Every structure is written in C-alpha cells, then in structure tokens.
Design a protein around this ligand. Sequence first.
Ligand SMILES: O=P(O)(O)[C@@H](CCCc1cccc(Oc2ccccc2Cc2ccccc2)c1)S(=O)(=O)O
Ligand SMILES: [Mg+2]
Length: 284
Amino acid sequence: MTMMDMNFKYCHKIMKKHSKSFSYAFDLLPEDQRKAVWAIYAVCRKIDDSIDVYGDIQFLNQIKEDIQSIEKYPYEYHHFQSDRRIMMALQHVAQHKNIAFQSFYNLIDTVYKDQHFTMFETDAELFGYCYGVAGTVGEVLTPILSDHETHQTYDVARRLGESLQLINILRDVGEDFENERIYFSKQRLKQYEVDIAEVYQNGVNNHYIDLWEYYAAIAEKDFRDVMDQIKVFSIEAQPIIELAARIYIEILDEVRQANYTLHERVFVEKRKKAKLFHEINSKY
Ligand SMILES: O=P(O)(O)[C@@H](CCCc1cccc(Oc2ccccc2Cc2ccccc2)c1)S(=O)(=O)O
Ligand SMILES: [Mg+2]
C-alpha cells in the first residue's frame, strides 16, 4: 500500500461509515473511478460537518482554502490546512479529471448560509437548497461518471442529486425537527394545513400524508427523468447510478411502510439492496 493508497482507503472508510447506500452501489465501479468517488464523497462530507468541529466557520474556511489551492496549482505541493488525507486524494483526482470547482464553492456557500437558517418561504427556495447541498455534488461527480460531459450530463447529474436530497428530507422529517430544522416550505405547509411540531407530537394525519406525498411525487418524477436519460453516463457507471438511485428511492416506500413516522430513521436493509442489485445487474 502506498501513501496515496492510504489516503483513498481513509476516504473509503468515511463513505462506508456515512452512506451505506451510496458505498454499496459506487464501490462497484472500476477501481480508478470508485477511488475518485470516495475522494469526492469525503470532501463533501467534511464540508457538510465542518461547522460543528469548533462551532464556527474556521474548519470550513480551511477546507475552502485547501480546495482553492488545488484549483489554482493542481501540480504543486500544498501544505493543507484541513484534512490532509482527503485533500491529497482530491488533488490526485484533480490531476486526472476536470473538477467543477465552482460546484464545491456553491456547496460551501450553502453550508455557510445554513448557519443563519430560516424556513423556506417557497418550494423554489427549498429546491435551491437541494441544488446547493446535493445538485452541486452531482456536478462534481459528472466527469468521473461519464466519458464525454455535455450540458445534459450535468443536468441529469444535478437532477439526480436534487432527487436524492429530497428523499433524504422526506426520510428525516422527525430528526430534522428535533434539530430545529423544517425543510418543507411555508407556502406548502400553509396550503396543506400542516404544523410539523403538531405532527411530531400527535402523529401523522391526512394533511401531513398529502403534503409528504406531494414532495415524494416530485422526487419520483425526478428519478424517472434521470432513469430515462441514464445513457448520459458511461456504460460502466449506468448500472451503478441506477442501483444507487433505486436503493435510495426505496426509502420512500420504507417511510410509507413505517406509517410516515417522525420518530425513527427508516432504512432499506442490506439484503434488499442486494435484491435491487440483482434486478439491475440482470437488466444490463
Ligand atoms: O447536508 P447534510 O449534511 O444534511 C447531508 C449531506 C448530503 C447532501 C447530499 C444528499 C444526497 C445526495 C448527495 O450527493 C449526490 C449527488 C448526486 C449523485 C450522488 C450523490 C451521493 C454521492 C456523493 C458523493 C459521492 C458518491 C455519491 C448529497 S447528509 O448528512 O448526508 O444527510
Ligand atoms: Mg437529512
């Protein structure tokens, strides 16, 4: 094992620990591709979690400055300020692939802003946030997942990221509420006559179910559009992306089966992930 191998193994550890779904699917990529995906995942995870290290922006600004140094001087040796293992891996990736650095900056900007979180007035703001935290990641992954990137490749990867984030939101209503976060828009909450606090206390009702399903239908339509355009991705990535998306969308059914509970995090068991791999692997 080389030093650079050690860096990518650490990135792999982070991904496996935090997302059983995405690790399960993306670990099926060819070696060079899955290592790049691990490095991208680990950078994004570190960004996502940066505020709680100290309680402020300091680690986030370090990550940002590390990414900036890679962008400006990808073939120079850097003394990284944040997580060296991850940044060395990211830099290695940057040497071989055309990374959308502004997408990392858009994600960092979204994390900074989230410090002053106020509820989304409209769905447009909710979808802007989905772009910021997940559509951005889709854009970063695009050159890894395709041979010849076009605007469509980015569009589809963006829509995928946004669909996956909306599913995450739909899974985590209760937990987010405990953490003083509600992601459904004020406009829709008012239209559907839903008070998340009231529902967390008293259980589901038809108004809440209708609202949850309104958003679930959006995620499902997004998912279908991505599947319909899956051929933007390289032949090797196509089944992996399909698997990842299918495993993640199965979470919607898990929520329904658990009666839309606000009090546990539902999950797709490993054996069911394998069932989906079989179905997809057979298709290809
Ligand atoms: O904002 P937090 O912190 O609440 C939240 C942070 C997570 C935000 C998010 C949600 C969903 C999907 C995302 O990225 C993708 C976009 C397009 C395609 C694939 C992927 C998955 C992927 C990422 C990298 C490498 C491989 C796979 C990102 S959380 O902690 O994970 O829930
Ligand atoms: Mg969540």
